[PDB]
Amino acid sequence: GVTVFFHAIILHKVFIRGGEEFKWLHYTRDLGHDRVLVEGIVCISKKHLDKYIPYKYVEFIYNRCLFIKSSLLGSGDWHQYYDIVLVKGKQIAAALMLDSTFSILQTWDTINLNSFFTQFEQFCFVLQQPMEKEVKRYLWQHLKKHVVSKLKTGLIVLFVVEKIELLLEGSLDWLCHLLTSDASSPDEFHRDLSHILGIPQSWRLYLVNLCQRCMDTRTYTWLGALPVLHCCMELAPRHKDAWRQPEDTWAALEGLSFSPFREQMLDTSSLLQFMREKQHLLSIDEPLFRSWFSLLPLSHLVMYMENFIEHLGRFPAHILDCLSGIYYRLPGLEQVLNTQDVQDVQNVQNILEMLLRLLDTYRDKIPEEALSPSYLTVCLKLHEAICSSTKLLKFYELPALSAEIVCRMIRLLSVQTVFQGTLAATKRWLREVFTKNMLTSSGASFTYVKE
């Protein structure tokens, strides 16, 4: 037989009766609050599964209907809830459902986890189609109260809110802090995440819908949660032309539109402060750095390479990523160089000087397993842009720095073609810059003082 556990809300004796599929109970705990929760167990045949089995309580209806659906039955027991014998009862029963379904998470293990998942799926199937802002608000209340081993509960809360379509109304902070792993080690992170992510479920989609929020609502705590998403993403390895990968893949932000948030986030100082607080994350998840490099505007990229110079010293294979990131910003760079604003051009010069610092300082430290010649090409791209947008002569330092980057990359190691392209771009820049002769008609003075 397959068993069903009916619950109900309201001396007298209650009885369970209906169709003869089983013609014509016990006290659980009298909550108080002017109500009692009365339950009952009954085991029906094993062939009556997924069949309508209307029932009754002797009940006042403002016939009930059961569906023991074979798609949600686990060990073989079903749990029917929310039976009342309205909105007030709905809220009370939501509270009790939350408490009951979380009373199984005591011994975090695959067994109790799957039991919780099965009970939740069953009851929510019964709930969403029984045949509501207040309900969502009160459920958020009880959830926050019951919850405030942190990563598992964060993922569980995320799964729940996505199942109950409970948007995080103004407090993404708390859930993103829960999903933020204080673990300073990668193995510990994977250990905390595995027992809960190994379950077949839509973790990636939930995390992506959580990350899109906190970006469309203009916040930053979600960054600390990016690592988890990455474990759920199962990203692919880099190839011979990693530069050809889109910015969303290379940055490990698939399914997220970050360019709008990147360009519309008006306070990047707090972003960098949050980052520096959670710098340990960079060690447990490699791509995180990249992701961050992708979520920062071109005006606050040097600070990101400076504050986290130590990490790059521990992880020099990230230096190259910087270049890649800058490549994915080429338009903006050009948008800045095609103009003559000294501040932004100077920021770009600073960026390139920082990249040269990284190369030289950490020239004797990069791991040959991450030093692909693709970056050479990437560098060349950069050069071309710096030589195509930089029209004035008082900005030779940027073509010079680009050529120096190419030189250091070649020294780190096709090559001839990249050198040809670099020389060609330099000659083109000199041509489009030196349009008049070097010396005056008399020859006494030069035309361009800086030639």
Q: Compute the distance between CA of residue 58 and CA of residue 24 in angstroms, rounded to an integer.
A: 10
Q: Compute the distance between CA of residue 215 and CA of residue 221 in angstroms, rounded to an integer.
A: 10
Q: Compute the distance between CA of residue 253 and CA of residue 279 in angstroms, rounded to an integer.
A: 19
Whole-Å CA distances, 51 to 21, 129, 281, 317, 353: 10, 16, 51, 60, 72
- 114 in Cβ contact with 39 (< 8 Å): no
Bridge partners of 18, per DSSP, are 55
Experimental structure resolution, Å: 3.0
Instruction: Give backbone dihedrals phi and psi of 40, rounded to 5 degrees, phi first.
Output: -165, 145
Question: Taking the mean position of all CA atoms in its chain, how far away is CA 387?
Answer: 36
β-pairing verdict for 2-9 and 55-57: unpaired
Q: What is the DSSP string of 155-178?
A: HHHHHHHHHTT----S-HHHHHHH
Return the SS3 of 228.
helix
Q: Compute the distance between CA of residue 27 and CA of residue 38 in angstroms, rounded to an integer.
A: 5
This entry's atomic model was obtained through cryo-EM
Angle separating helix axes 342-361 and 397-411, nearest 10 degrees: 20
Question: Taking the mean position of all CA atoms in its chain, how far away is CA 202?
Answer: 14
Output the six-digit token pair for 181: 């792993």
Long-range pairs, 260-269, Cβ under 8 A, ≥24: 260/215, 261/215, 261/216, 261/218, 261/295, 262/294, 262/295, 262/296, 262/297, 263/297, 264/218, 265/218, 265/220, 265/297, 268/296, 268/297, 268/299, 268/300, 269/300
Give the burial string for 97-131 (b: 16+ CB within 10 Å, else e). Answer: bbebbbebbeebeeeebebbbbbbbbbbebbeeee
- 83 in Cβ contact with 74 (< 8 Å): no
Q: Kindly report the CA angle at 151 between 146 and 154, in degrees rounded to 5?
A: 45
416 Cβ contact partners less than 8 Å away, ≥ 6 residues apart: none
Long-range pairs, 94-98, Cβ under 8 A, ≥24: 94/135, 94/138, 94/139, 94/142, 95/138, 95/139, 95/142, 96/31, 96/37, 97/123, 98/139, 98/142, 98/143, 98/146
Q: Kindly report the CA angle at 331 between 328 and 333, in degrees rounded to 5?
A: 95
Give the burial string for 165-181 (b: 16+ CB within 10 Å, else e). Answer: ebebeeebebbbbbbbb
Whole-Å CA distances, 326 to 68, 187, 433: 56, 31, 25
Q: What is the DSSP string of 73-105?
A: -SSSEEEE---B--HHHHHHHHHHHHHHHHTTT
- 160 in Cβ contact with 143 (< 8 Å): yes
Q: Compute the distance between CA of residue 343 and CA of residue 333 in angstroms, rounded to an integer.
A: 13
Helix-, strand-, coil-residue percentages of the chain, each rounded to 5: 55, 10, 35
Output the six-digit token pair for 425: 């771009």
Output the six-digit token pair for 214: 């906190």
Where does 19-149 show beta strands of DSSP type E?
Answer: 26-32, 35-44, 55-57, 77-80
Tokens 């959830």 correspond to 143
Cα torsion through 134, 139, 145, 147, rounded to 10: -150
Instruction: Give backbone dihedrals phi and psi of 168, rounded to 5 degrees, phi first.
Output: -80, 90
